[PDB]
Amino acid sequence: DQLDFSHFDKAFENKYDIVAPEFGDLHQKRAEFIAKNQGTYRPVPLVPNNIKGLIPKTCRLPATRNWYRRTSSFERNGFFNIHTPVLNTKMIPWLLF
Protein backbone atom coordinates (compact mmCIF):
# COMPACT_ATOMS: atom_id res chain seq x y z
CA ASP A 1 0.00 0.00 0.00
CA GLN A 2 1.03 3.62 0.53
CA LEU A 3 3.94 4.87 2.67
CA ASP A 4 6.12 2.27 0.91
CA PHE A 5 8.19 4.58 -1.28
CA SER A 6 9.76 1.73 -3.27
CA HIS A 7 7.19 2.38 -6.01
CA PHE A 8 5.08 5.42 -6.84
CA ASP A 9 1.51 5.53 -5.54
CA LYS A 10 -1.44 7.40 -7.05
CA ALA A 11 -2.24 8.62 -3.53
CA PHE A 12 0.72 11.01 -3.92
CA GLU A 13 -0.35 12.26 -7.36
CA ASN A 14 -0.47 16.08 -7.52
CA LYS A 15 -2.23 17.14 -10.72
CA TYR A 16 -5.17 19.51 -11.14
CA ASP A 17 -8.14 18.52 -13.28
CA ILE A 18 -8.37 20.39 -16.59
CA VAL A 19 -11.96 21.61 -16.26
CA ALA A 20 -11.86 24.12 -19.12
CA PRO A 21 -9.36 25.59 -21.59
CA GLU A 22 -7.07 28.03 -19.81
CA PHE A 23 -7.61 31.01 -22.13
CA GLY A 24 -11.01 30.24 -23.63
CA ASP A 25 -12.65 28.20 -26.37
CA LEU A 26 -11.47 30.59 -29.08
CA HIS A 27 -7.90 30.31 -27.78
CA GLN A 28 -8.22 26.52 -27.88
CA LYS A 29 -9.60 26.64 -31.43
CA ARG A 30 -6.74 28.85 -32.60
CA ALA A 31 -4.26 26.53 -30.88
CA GLU A 32 -5.75 23.60 -32.80
CA PHE A 33 -5.65 25.60 -36.04
CA ILE A 34 -1.97 26.33 -35.41
CA ALA A 35 -1.35 22.65 -34.67
CA LYS A 36 -2.94 21.75 -38.03
CA ASN A 37 -2.21 24.70 -40.34
CA GLN A 38 1.26 25.78 -39.19
CA GLY A 39 3.38 26.39 -42.28
CA THR A 40 0.44 26.16 -44.70
CA TYR A 41 -1.63 29.28 -43.91
CA ARG A 42 0.95 32.02 -44.51
CA PRO A 43 -0.46 35.56 -44.39
CA VAL A 44 1.24 38.22 -46.50
CA PRO A 45 1.16 41.85 -45.28
CA LEU A 46 -0.46 44.10 -47.85
CA VAL A 47 1.89 45.96 -50.21
CA PRO A 48 0.74 47.36 -53.58
CA ASN A 49 1.86 45.18 -56.48
CA ASN A 50 2.68 48.07 -58.84
CA ILE A 51 4.19 51.27 -57.42
CA LYS A 52 5.49 54.04 -59.67
CA GLY A 53 9.09 55.13 -59.14
CA LEU A 54 10.23 51.87 -57.52
CA ILE A 55 12.21 49.04 -59.12
CA PRO A 56 10.58 45.72 -58.13
CA LYS A 57 12.77 43.33 -56.16
CA THR A 58 13.01 40.04 -58.06
CA CYS A 59 16.35 38.71 -56.75
CA ARG A 60 18.88 39.18 -53.98
CA LEU A 61 21.06 42.27 -54.15
CA PRO A 62 24.88 42.27 -54.10
CA ALA A 63 26.92 43.64 -51.23
CA THR A 64 27.81 46.60 -53.47
CA ARG A 65 24.28 47.97 -52.92
CA ASN A 66 24.60 48.44 -49.15
CA TRP A 67 24.45 51.92 -47.64
CA TYR A 68 26.24 50.72 -44.49
CA ARG A 69 29.04 48.18 -44.02
CA ARG A 70 28.07 46.06 -41.03
CA THR A 71 30.67 45.27 -38.37
CA SER A 72 29.71 41.95 -36.79
CA SER A 73 29.56 38.66 -38.68
CA PHE A 74 28.53 35.01 -38.34
CA GLU A 75 30.67 31.90 -38.22
CA ARG A 76 28.76 29.19 -40.08
CA ASN A 77 28.63 26.99 -36.98
CA GLY A 78 26.31 29.65 -35.56
CA PHE A 79 28.93 31.81 -33.85
CA PHE A 80 28.61 35.59 -33.59
CA ASN A 81 31.81 37.54 -34.30
CA ILE A 82 31.80 40.95 -32.68
CA HIS A 83 35.51 41.17 -33.53
CA THR A 84 35.98 41.37 -37.31
CA PRO A 85 38.46 42.99 -39.71
CA VAL A 86 35.71 45.56 -40.29
CA LEU A 87 35.72 46.14 -36.53
CA ASN A 88 39.49 46.66 -36.63
CA THR A 89 39.16 49.17 -39.46
CA LYS A 90 36.38 50.99 -37.61
CA MET A 91 38.39 51.06 -34.37
CA ILE A 92 41.43 52.56 -36.14
CA PRO A 93 39.91 56.11 -36.21
CA TRP A 94 38.43 56.26 -32.70
CA LEU A 95 41.55 54.89 -31.00
CA LEU A 96 43.58 57.45 -32.96
CA PHE A 97 41.54 60.32 -31.53
Partner: protein, 243 residues
Protein backbone atom coordinates in the same frame (compact mmCIF):
# COMPACT_ATOMS: atom_id res chain seq x y z
CA UNK B 1 4.69 35.47 -24.09
CA UNK B 2 4.17 32.31 -26.12
CA UNK B 3 0.53 32.08 -25.00
CA UNK B 4 -0.17 34.92 -27.44
CA UNK B 5 -0.92 33.25 -30.76
CA UNK B 6 0.54 34.89 -33.88
CA UNK B 7 0.27 33.09 -37.20
CA UNK B 8 3.30 34.92 -38.61
CA UNK B 9 5.30 33.75 -35.58
CA UNK B 10 4.02 30.21 -36.12
CA UNK B 11 5.06 30.38 -39.78
CA UNK B 12 8.52 31.55 -38.73
CA UNK B 13 8.80 28.68 -36.23
CA UNK B 14 7.71 26.18 -38.89
CA UNK B 15 10.21 27.60 -41.38
CA UNK B 16 13.04 27.37 -38.85
CA UNK B 17 12.10 23.80 -37.91
CA UNK B 18 11.75 22.71 -41.54
CA UNK B 19 15.11 24.24 -42.44
CA UNK B 20 16.66 22.49 -39.44
CA UNK B 21 15.19 19.10 -40.37
CA UNK B 22 15.00 18.89 -44.17
CA UNK B 23 17.95 21.04 -45.25
CA UNK B 24 21.14 19.15 -44.38
CA UNK B 25 24.84 19.95 -44.28
CA UNK B 26 25.49 17.46 -47.09
CA UNK B 27 23.91 19.08 -50.16
CA UNK B 28 23.77 17.32 -53.52
CA UNK B 29 25.18 19.21 -56.50
CA UNK B 30 24.97 18.74 -60.27
CA UNK B 31 27.05 21.77 -61.37
CA UNK B 32 30.13 19.81 -62.46
CA UNK B 33 32.49 21.05 -65.18
CA UNK B 34 34.84 18.69 -67.00
CA UNK B 35 37.78 20.52 -68.62
CA UNK B 36 38.77 19.55 -72.15
CA UNK B 37 42.53 19.35 -71.51
CA UNK B 38 44.96 17.75 -69.07
CA UNK B 39 45.50 20.03 -66.07
CA UNK B 40 49.16 20.56 -65.11
CA UNK B 41 49.17 21.15 -61.36
CA UNK B 42 52.25 22.49 -59.59
CA UNK B 43 54.25 20.87 -56.78
CA UNK B 44 51.56 21.78 -54.24
CA UNK B 45 48.69 20.17 -56.16
CA UNK B 46 47.40 23.53 -57.41
CA UNK B 47 47.02 25.23 -60.79
CA UNK B 48 47.40 28.99 -61.17
CA UNK B 49 44.23 30.31 -62.81
CA UNK B 50 44.66 34.08 -62.33
CA UNK B 51 47.54 36.47 -61.67
CA UNK B 52 47.68 40.24 -61.29
CA UNK B 53 49.44 43.09 -59.47
CA UNK B 54 46.45 45.16 -58.33
CA UNK B 55 48.26 47.59 -56.02
CA UNK B 56 50.80 48.11 -58.80
CA UNK B 57 47.96 49.23 -61.10
CA UNK B 58 45.84 51.00 -58.45
CA UNK B 59 45.75 54.72 -57.75
CA UNK B 60 46.64 54.92 -54.06
CA UNK B 61 47.45 58.54 -53.20
CA UNK B 62 45.71 60.90 -55.65
CA UNK B 63 42.28 59.32 -55.77
CA UNK B 64 39.58 61.86 -56.53
CA UNK B 65 36.92 61.26 -53.82
CA UNK B 66 39.46 61.57 -50.98
CA UNK B 67 41.82 64.32 -52.14
CA UNK B 68 38.75 66.55 -51.89
CA UNK B 69 38.39 65.86 -48.16
CA UNK B 70 42.13 66.05 -47.53
CA UNK B 71 42.27 69.43 -49.29
CA UNK B 72 39.22 70.69 -47.39
CA UNK B 73 40.99 69.90 -44.10
CA UNK B 74 43.22 73.04 -44.26
CA UNK B 75 40.10 75.18 -44.76
CA UNK B 76 38.71 73.98 -41.42
CA UNK B 77 42.11 74.33 -39.73
CA UNK B 78 42.41 77.93 -40.95
CA UNK B 79 38.81 78.65 -39.96
CA UNK B 80 39.54 77.51 -36.41
CA UNK B 81 42.87 79.35 -36.23
CA UNK B 82 41.66 82.83 -37.20
CA UNK B 83 37.91 82.47 -36.49
CA UNK B 84 36.77 84.51 -39.53
CA UNK B 85 33.08 84.01 -38.67
CA UNK B 86 33.40 85.50 -35.15
CA UNK B 87 32.06 82.24 -33.73
CA UNK B 88 32.12 81.10 -30.11
CA UNK B 89 34.60 78.74 -28.45
CA UNK B 90 32.29 75.74 -28.79
CA UNK B 91 31.53 76.68 -32.40
CA UNK B 92 35.20 76.81 -33.40
CA UNK B 93 35.81 73.58 -31.49
CA UNK B 94 33.06 72.03 -33.61
CA UNK B 95 34.82 73.49 -36.66
CA UNK B 96 37.86 71.46 -35.60
CA UNK B 97 35.85 68.21 -35.54
CA UNK B 98 36.19 67.72 -39.30
CA UNK B 99 39.99 67.15 -39.64
CA UNK B 100 39.61 64.01 -37.47
CA UNK B 101 37.25 62.20 -39.87
CA UNK B 102 38.20 63.31 -43.40
CA UNK B 103 40.81 60.54 -43.83
CA UNK B 104 38.39 57.72 -42.94
CA UNK B 105 37.15 57.36 -46.56
CA UNK B 106 40.77 57.08 -47.70
CA UNK B 107 41.39 54.45 -45.02
CA UNK B 108 38.40 52.47 -46.27
CA UNK B 109 39.57 52.77 -49.88
CA UNK B 110 43.02 51.50 -48.90
CA UNK B 111 41.39 48.59 -47.09
CA UNK B 112 39.30 47.87 -50.19
CA UNK B 113 42.53 47.74 -52.21
CA UNK B 114 43.41 44.53 -50.32
CA UNK B 115 40.36 42.64 -51.66
CA UNK B 116 41.55 42.93 -55.27
CA UNK B 117 42.72 39.43 -56.12
CA UNK B 118 46.45 39.09 -56.76
CA UNK B 119 46.60 35.33 -57.38
CA UNK B 120 44.03 32.55 -57.56
CA UNK B 121 44.82 28.84 -57.61
CA UNK B 122 42.56 25.83 -58.12
CA UNK B 123 43.35 22.92 -55.82
CA UNK B 124 43.13 19.27 -56.80
CA UNK B 125 39.59 17.94 -56.63
CA UNK B 126 38.07 21.09 -58.12
CA UNK B 127 36.18 22.08 -54.97
CA UNK B 128 38.53 24.57 -53.24
CA UNK B 129 40.16 27.71 -54.64
CA UNK B 130 43.05 29.46 -52.93
CA UNK B 131 43.20 33.26 -53.12
CA UNK B 132 46.30 35.35 -52.40
CA UNK B 133 45.98 39.11 -51.81
CA UNK B 134 47.84 41.61 -49.66
CA UNK B 135 47.14 44.66 -47.54
CA UNK B 136 48.79 47.82 -48.87
CA UNK B 137 51.23 47.73 -45.96
CA UNK B 138 52.50 44.56 -47.63
CA UNK B 139 50.54 42.12 -45.44
CA UNK B 140 50.06 38.95 -47.47
CA UNK B 141 46.74 37.16 -46.95
CA UNK B 142 45.83 33.68 -48.20
CA UNK B 143 42.28 32.33 -48.03
CA UNK B 144 40.72 29.08 -49.23
CA UNK B 145 37.11 29.27 -50.45
CA UNK B 146 34.79 26.59 -51.78
CA UNK B 147 34.02 27.04 -55.47
CA UNK B 148 30.26 27.13 -54.87
CA UNK B 149 30.61 30.30 -52.78
CA UNK B 150 31.36 32.36 -55.90
CA UNK B 151 28.63 34.51 -57.46
CA UNK B 152 29.74 36.68 -60.40
CA UNK B 153 28.43 40.24 -60.52
CA UNK B 154 27.59 42.37 -63.54
CA UNK B 155 30.00 44.86 -65.09
CA UNK B 156 28.35 47.77 -63.26
CA UNK B 157 28.34 45.66 -60.04
CA UNK B 158 24.75 46.77 -59.33
CA UNK B 159 23.07 43.36 -59.66
CA UNK B 160 23.84 39.65 -59.45
CA UNK B 161 24.97 38.38 -62.84
CA UNK B 162 23.52 35.04 -63.88
CA UNK B 163 25.55 32.25 -62.29
CA UNK B 164 25.84 30.62 -65.72
CA UNK B 165 25.67 31.97 -69.29
CA UNK B 166 27.66 35.01 -68.12
CA UNK B 167 30.46 36.17 -70.43
CA UNK B 168 33.07 38.08 -68.43
CA UNK B 169 35.92 36.57 -70.49
CA UNK B 170 37.07 37.59 -73.96
CA UNK B 171 37.22 35.15 -76.87
CA UNK B 172 40.91 34.45 -76.26
CA UNK B 173 40.21 33.95 -72.54
CA UNK B 174 41.26 37.26 -71.00
CA UNK B 175 38.88 39.26 -68.84
CA UNK B 176 36.57 41.53 -70.82
CA UNK B 177 36.09 43.81 -67.79
CA UNK B 178 37.09 44.06 -64.14
CA UNK B 179 35.02 41.26 -62.63
CA UNK B 180 33.44 41.54 -59.19
CA UNK B 181 32.51 38.30 -57.45
CA UNK B 182 30.56 37.98 -54.20
CA UNK B 183 31.38 35.22 -51.71
CA UNK B 184 28.63 34.27 -49.28
CA UNK B 185 31.08 33.36 -46.50
CA UNK B 186 34.78 34.24 -46.72
CA UNK B 187 37.04 33.02 -43.91
CA UNK B 188 39.63 35.80 -43.92
CA UNK B 189 42.52 35.55 -41.42
CA UNK B 190 40.43 33.13 -39.34
CA UNK B 191 37.13 35.06 -39.20
CA UNK B 192 34.12 34.38 -41.42
CA UNK B 193 32.53 37.42 -43.07
CA UNK B 194 29.29 37.34 -45.04
CA UNK B 195 28.81 38.80 -48.53
CA UNK B 196 32.40 39.77 -49.35
CA UNK B 197 33.03 41.32 -52.78
CA UNK B 198 36.38 40.48 -54.39
CA UNK B 199 37.69 41.83 -57.68
CA UNK B 200 39.69 40.41 -60.58
CA UNK B 201 41.16 43.26 -62.60
CA UNK B 202 41.13 43.27 -66.39
CA UNK B 203 44.83 44.20 -66.38
CA UNK B 204 45.67 40.80 -64.89
CA UNK B 205 46.53 37.67 -66.84
CA UNK B 206 44.09 34.76 -66.81
CA UNK B 207 45.91 31.45 -67.19
CA UNK B 208 43.61 28.48 -67.87
CA UNK B 209 40.51 30.62 -68.54
CA UNK B 210 38.12 27.64 -68.60
CA UNK B 211 38.97 26.59 -65.05
CA UNK B 212 38.90 30.25 -64.02
CA UNK B 213 35.39 30.64 -65.40
CA UNK B 214 34.30 27.40 -63.74
CA UNK B 215 35.65 28.80 -60.48
CA UNK B 216 33.72 32.06 -60.90
CA UNK B 217 30.46 30.45 -62.03
CA UNK B 218 30.53 28.07 -59.05
CA UNK B 219 31.05 24.76 -60.86
CA UNK B 220 32.99 21.92 -59.28
CA UNK B 221 35.87 21.17 -61.64
CA UNK B 222 36.78 17.59 -62.51
CA UNK B 223 40.54 17.14 -62.06
CA UNK B 224 40.80 13.47 -63.03
CA UNK B 225 42.93 14.17 -66.13
CA UNK B 226 45.89 15.79 -64.42
CA UNK B 227 49.68 15.78 -64.37
CA UNK B 228 52.09 17.11 -61.74
CA UNK B 229 54.96 19.48 -62.53
CA UNK B 230 58.15 19.19 -60.45
CA UNK B 231 59.21 22.84 -60.32
CA UNK B 232 59.97 24.48 -56.97
CA UNK B 233 60.48 27.90 -58.53
CA UNK B 234 58.76 29.79 -55.68
CA UNK B 235 60.21 30.54 -52.25
CA UNK B 236 58.29 31.29 -49.07
CA UNK B 237 57.57 35.03 -48.80
CA UNK B 238 58.84 35.49 -52.36
CA UNK B 239 59.19 39.11 -53.42
CA UNK B 240 56.87 40.42 -56.11
CA UNK B 241 56.21 43.66 -57.98
CA UNK B 242 52.83 43.95 -56.19
CA UNK B 243 54.15 46.22 -53.46
Amino acid sequence: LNHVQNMLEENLKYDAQKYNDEVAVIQKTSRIYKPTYTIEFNREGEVLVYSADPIKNSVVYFKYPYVLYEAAIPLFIWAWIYNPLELSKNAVNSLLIYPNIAWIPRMWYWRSLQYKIQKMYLLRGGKVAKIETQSLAGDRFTSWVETYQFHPLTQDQKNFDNQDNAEFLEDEGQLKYELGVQLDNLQEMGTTSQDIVINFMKEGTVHHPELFEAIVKGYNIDTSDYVINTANNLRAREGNHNH
